[PDB]
Amino acid sequence: KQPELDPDTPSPIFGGSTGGLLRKAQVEEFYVITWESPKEQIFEMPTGGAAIMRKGPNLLKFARKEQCMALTTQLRSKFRQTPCFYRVYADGKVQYLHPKDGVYPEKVNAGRVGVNQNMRSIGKNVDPIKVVKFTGSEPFEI
């Protein structure tokens, strides 16, 4: 069960910085991350300095998506902690992205069907002949 975003979640103790949180975050979108973080500890922020983190699930949020994938990968690095992602649009609609499979896209989950791929040797593509349409960047099969 992919968990959905929950407002009114406490935040880690930190002073402030000058990264992100601009006009884009108010009228376009903002991204959210949540993760366990037991054993209240010290961590580093991708757009700031060092901060403390209580035990129990805690939630953060930033401006760009990579600003949270960096934290997910960090959490991989040291102690096995398992955060998640969230999307937000102007209408308030929320979308869950990472990890949809729940098993961290680097590992397969029981079964799905992927797109944007073709069974052809590297190269051996089509010459610019018969490619006058050019459809932006061709999938070569659609």
Partner 1 sequence: ATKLFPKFSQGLAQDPSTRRIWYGLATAHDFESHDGMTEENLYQKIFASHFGQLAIIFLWTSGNLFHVAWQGNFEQWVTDPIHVRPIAHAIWDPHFGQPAVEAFTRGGASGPVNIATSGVYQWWYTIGLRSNQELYVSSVFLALVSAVFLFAGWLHLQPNFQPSLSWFKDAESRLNHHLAGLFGVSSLAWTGHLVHVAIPESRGQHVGWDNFLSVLPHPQGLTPFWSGNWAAYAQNPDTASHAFGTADGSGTAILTFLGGFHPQTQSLWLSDMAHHHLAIAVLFIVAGHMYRTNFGIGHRLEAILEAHTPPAGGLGAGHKGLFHTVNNSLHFQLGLALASVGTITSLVAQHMYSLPPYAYLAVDFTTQASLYTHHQYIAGFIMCGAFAHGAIFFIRDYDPEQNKGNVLARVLDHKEAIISHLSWVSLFLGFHTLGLYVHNDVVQAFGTPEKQILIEPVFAQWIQAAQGKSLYGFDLLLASSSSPAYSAGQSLWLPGWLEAINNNQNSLFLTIGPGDFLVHHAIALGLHTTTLILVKGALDARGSKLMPDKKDFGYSFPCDGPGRGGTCDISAYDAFYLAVFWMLNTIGWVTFYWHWKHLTLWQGNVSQFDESSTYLMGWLRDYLWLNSSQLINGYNPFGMNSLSVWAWTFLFGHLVYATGFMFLISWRGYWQELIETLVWAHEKTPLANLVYWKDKPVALSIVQARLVGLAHFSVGYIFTYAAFLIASTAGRFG
Partner 2 sequence: AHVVKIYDTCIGCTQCVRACPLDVLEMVPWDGCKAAQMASSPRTEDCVGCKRCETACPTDFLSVRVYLGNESTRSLGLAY
Partner 3 sequence: EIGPKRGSLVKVLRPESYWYNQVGKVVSVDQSGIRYPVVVRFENQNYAGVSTNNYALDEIEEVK
Beta strands in 29-126 (DSSP E): 31-35, 41-44, 50-53, 58-62, 84-88, 94-95
Close Cβ partners of 90 (under 8 Å, ≥ 6 residues apart): 27, 28, 29
Contacts of 120 (CB under 8 A, 6+ apart): 140
Phi and psi torsions of 52, nearest 5°: -105, 160
Residues 107-126 that bind partner 2 (CB under 8 A): 107-109, 111-123
Residues touching partner 1, count (CB under 8 A): 12
Query: According to the binding rule CB under 8 A, does residue 23 interact with partner 1?
Result: yes
| Contact between 35 and 75 (Cβ < 8 Å) | yes
Residue closer to partner 2, measured from CB, 8 or 127 = 127
Q: Which stretch binds partner 3 (CB under 8 A): 9-17, 60-68, 71-79, 119-127?
A: 119-127
Find the shortest distance in angstroms from Cβ 113 to partner 1: 26
If you search the block for the tokens 């401006």, which residue do you land on? 63
Question: Which range of residues in 85-93, 102-110, 120-128, 129-137 is near partner 3 by CB under 8 A?
Answer: 120-128
Q: Any contact of residue 7 with partner 1 (CB under 8 A)? A: no
Token pair of 89, please? 């649009």
Nearer to partner 2 by Cβ, of 8 and 141: the residue is 141
Of 45, 51, 70, 88, which one interacts with partner 2 (CB under 8 A)?
Answer: 70
Considering only residues 13, 118, 136, 141, which one is a binding residue for partner 1 as defined by CB under 8 A? 136
In a 3-state reduction of DSSP, which class is residue 31?
A: strand
Q: Footprint of partner 1 on this chain (CB under 8 A)?
A: 18, 22-23, 122-123, 125, 127-129, 132, 134, 136
